[PDB]
Design a protein around this ligand. Structure first.
Ligand SMILES: CC[C@@H](NC(=O)c1cc2[nH]nc(NC(=O)c3ccc(N4CCN(C)CC4)cc3)c2s1)c1ccccc1
Length: 253
């Protein structure tokens, strides 16, 4: 409860964002290691999401799950807000991917699991994430997926956002079964299923729902992705169904 910008010995920057950045930091009394996210008040409104933050902070801190990154506390000074976040030692599913190009079945399978279960829970507890992309996943020392950033849970790249949303229509929590599908595809193939060179065609690709599997994609996965990526929210499985899918279990952990 209420720390000050002076309980913190600040260290390596972990990420440089538009609104703010995020640092390695250690609380001086406890020697605790956290990610100190430092957002800037000025821009949050010059953008308007000052409230899409009121959501992340409230939503975050109230959640307890091994694959969701913990918000520990928060305090703003006069210039900016600070968010004492949990620290994720292995970095992002994003770098991990650029690093390795493609993930294997077991790895992809496991992550979808961790993300499924983590995602189920958010849904058990009523909440939907939406903005699930590789940039927002982090890895613990154990090496396990963890979900970060919510401010978008209750512009940029369309790549992971389902038809409904994008097409404006009111949306629910199928959103995330769609991402979970794109997510899945991206891991196994390395690009997301609706990759394009422009915002324009990418809209097309997602709305017409146009994607094609590389030769080395297995049917077990092939099938999985195809029931996550249906244009109609209704025809999208529940996470329990997902965790059931065979490929998803004879390959997870
Ligand atoms: C999801 C993006 C969001 N980020 C967070 O909330 C974040 C929360 C959070 N907790 N821990 C982090 N740690 C790291 O970012 C990290 C990155 C690379 C690392 N390695 C160095 C090289 N090595 C070979 C692998 C390990 C280790 C830790 C981050 S980022 C964000 C939002 C606004 C502004 C900045 C960042």
């Amino acid at each position: 409860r209420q720390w000050a910008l002076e309980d913190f010995e600040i260290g390596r920057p972990l990420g440089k964002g538009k609104f703010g950045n995020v640092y390695l930091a250690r609380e001086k009394q406890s020697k605790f290691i956290l990610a100190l996210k430092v957002l800037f008040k000025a821009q949050l409104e010059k953008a308007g999401v000052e409230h899409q933050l009121r959501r992340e902070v409230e939503i975050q801190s109230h959640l307890r799950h091994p694959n969701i990154l913990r918000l520990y506390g928060y305090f703003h000074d006069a210039t900016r807000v600070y968010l004492i976040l949990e620290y994720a030692p292995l970095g992002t599913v994003y770098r991990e991917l650029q690093k390795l190009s493609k993930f294997d079945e077991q790895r992809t399978a496991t992550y979808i699991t961790e993300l499924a279960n983590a995602l189920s829970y958010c849904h058990s507890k009523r909440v939907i994430h939406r903005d699930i992309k590789p940039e927002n996943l982090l890895l613990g020392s154990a090496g396990e997926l963890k979900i970060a950033d919510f401010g978008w849970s209750v512009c940029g790249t369309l790549d992971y956002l389902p038809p409904e949303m994008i097409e404006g229509r009111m949306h629910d929590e199928k959103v995330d079964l769609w991402s979970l599908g794109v997510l899945c595809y991206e891991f196994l193939v390395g690009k997301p299923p609706f990759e394009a060179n422009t915002y324009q065609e990418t809209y097309k690709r997602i709305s017409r729902v146009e994607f094609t599997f590389p030769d080395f994609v297995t049917e077990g996965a092939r099938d999985l992705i195809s029931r996550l990526l249906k244009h109609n929210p209704s025809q999208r499985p529940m996470l329990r169904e997902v965790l059931e899918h065979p490929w998803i279990t004879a390959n997870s952990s």
